């Protein structure tokens, strides 16, 4: 509804996670092929895993559209960043900080 | 000496109770780590362990609870008037939550060859669906049912809505049948209501 | 200039939706308190005005013989609950006089 | 776009005139509560706190009337059940069961 | 080993009074019921009976149930096989049917978070029926002392006006505990032609709106201070 | 009460035919829904020798 040439593409992996590839187009060309945009959303949590992507002008319209079908409303940008995402999801979700009995 | 060890091994025989009475755990310097054992009809499982401050005021550290239900409005709400009010309740919400995944576990093993088509899980276990079939008179019936839960502190149904993807036009049997379907998944389990679909 | 518009508008639609939903559901709990409260206000001046009928009815008739009613009946059911139950009553009794012997 | 002014514009008239009965509504229900209190002197006495009840139980029936339809007459055995509370022997008993429990809760 | 037992003690004071169970003996058996069939990847059957007696801040309870472990090198399962509950004649006579229930039902661990849950609501209930005594001790008579099964309030000098309130706990098949709180009216024939207002037939659901908006011993000191206070007479 | 224990001894006969010469609180007893609900428990037929078991007990107390 809001752009025309949106490239939308799912996958569905271990627990639940669903994959997101947003490939963004203006108006009028095939969209963005060589630089991707990725979602990782774990189907239960509030706490997304979003990447940076090189069109900065759509970044309101990527958090919002996420916050609509996931039945939220509010969305806040919270700021944290890594290169690892198996590190990132170990120190936000804390299931992998300690390992004792 | 014969006396203390026979004292050492009466506190280790009351220590191994406690883990099975549902909640164990040990002091520390940094807090107090307790492990929660749930099980359903008989079965239990893994313990998961949380781990909480003694000093004031009570904050968390780390647990092995996932974050797939949310533990921050709980914690602002009965963590602070008590404190045995609040392992207790978690320990009747993963006891629902161990219950959603013993019956999923279950629906993949033995009874996922009387289904058909793909099935559509969530993690936490809110809105099932899955469609069947079953031969009550030497027809295949596709009966697509879906479970909806009102109570999230509780492991029965309570929104029942079973629909059949074939065909309908038909006698009085199926519409005996979907009345016999929405009481046996409302006063019965999941996993002892597909036994009787085998007998 | 429309892409900003509708960004807008629609960051202006989650800004209206939760304060009038709280705002309804207490709007539905007020209207269960003022119903709740007219009603328990219509119960106790009902209940002090029998009291007063009864204190008036009372005052002159000290032996009359009392004719008991069937909404009454369940609760002359609870008080005669130790007349028959009294040999369940006496085994709680000896019980706890058994707890008092082994805690000395 | 002009969709949205469609579901904006009736948001925005369910906001102000809300607002304006709910500052009427309850500042009546405060008043008449003082009405009522003041003249039984019950105010919240915090001697212990107290979570209060689900809405399940609310609405459950009470205990009177599945004894009514289960009991299937009516009130002829009031009057033996009477004369079993009027005997001189039945009434001391329970004055035997009441001294007893007071025995226990001495000691 | 005086002072690793003194750190052990401390985590038994500690964990009965978090957990509010203390175990006062606990036996340790194991018998093996290991097959004598030969195949590949053989199972080890651990059966372990326990026996558990303990007790509540105020009731006793006695345990006998076995456990039979499947140890397999592909997937490690263990199923609770048999119950048994040796109850003793308490003050409370409404929890023998969850008895009934848990031994069918097979789960002991809704056993012992539900009757913890029990002694919470009849804790609550030493607590109110101590405050509800010794303030009115000429009107509010308890018949079976504070561990009764429903309670009444009785004027000195008007022997035929009596109020009965009952109070039973009611648990169900979602793991929750809840009480029931019901008014009974006593009032005889003579004043049924006095009343004109019918407040009488809607008294117990009158009673019950007390509860959810005022609380539970509010609503219960609202009706026994609001109908004294008459000196006229 | 020690003669009170003796009062409802002697007068334990008394007790009993005053309960079977009824019918409609006997009548009750064997509807297993109403005792579920109320907890109505009518069975008695051995009271005489549990009055001399909350004799002894009551003797026991007073003596200590």
Redesign the interface.
Known sequence: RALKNVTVSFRETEENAVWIRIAWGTQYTKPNQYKPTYVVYYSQTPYAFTSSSMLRRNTPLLGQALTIASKHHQIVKMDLRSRYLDSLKAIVFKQYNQTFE | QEALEEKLENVKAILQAYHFTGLSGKLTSRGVCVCISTAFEGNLLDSYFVDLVIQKPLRIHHHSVPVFIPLEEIAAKYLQTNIQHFLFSLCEYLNAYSGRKYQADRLQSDFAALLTGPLQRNPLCNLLSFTYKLDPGGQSFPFCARLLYKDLTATLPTDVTVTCQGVEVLSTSWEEQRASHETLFCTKPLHQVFASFTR | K??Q???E??????R?????KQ?QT??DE??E??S?????????S??????????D???QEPN?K?????????????????????????????????K??DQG | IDKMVETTELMTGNIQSLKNKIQILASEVEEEEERVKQMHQINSSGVLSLPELSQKTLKAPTLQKEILALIPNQNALLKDLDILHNSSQMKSMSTFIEEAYKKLDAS | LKNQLGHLESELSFLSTLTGINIRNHSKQTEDLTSTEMTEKSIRKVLQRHRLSGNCHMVTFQLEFQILEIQNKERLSSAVTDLNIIMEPTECSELSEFVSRAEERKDLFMFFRSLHFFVEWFEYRKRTFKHLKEKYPDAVYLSEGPSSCSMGIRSASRPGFELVIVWRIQIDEDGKVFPKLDLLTKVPQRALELDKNRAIETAPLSFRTLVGLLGIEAALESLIKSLCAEENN | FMMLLSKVEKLSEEIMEIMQNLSSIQALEGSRELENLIGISCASHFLKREMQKTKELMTKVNKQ
């Open positions: 429309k892409r518009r509708m960004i508008v629609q960051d202006e639609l989650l209206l939706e939760p304060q009038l705002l207490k709007y007020l209207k308190r003022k709740s409260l007219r009603n328990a206000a219509y119960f106790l009902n209940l002090k005005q029998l009291y007063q009928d009864y204190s009815v009372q005052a009359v009392e004719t008991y009613d069937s909404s009454s009946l369940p609760a002359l059911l609870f008080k005669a609950r130790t007349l028959l139950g009294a040999e369940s009553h006496l085994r709680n009794i000896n019980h706890q006089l058994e008092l012997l």
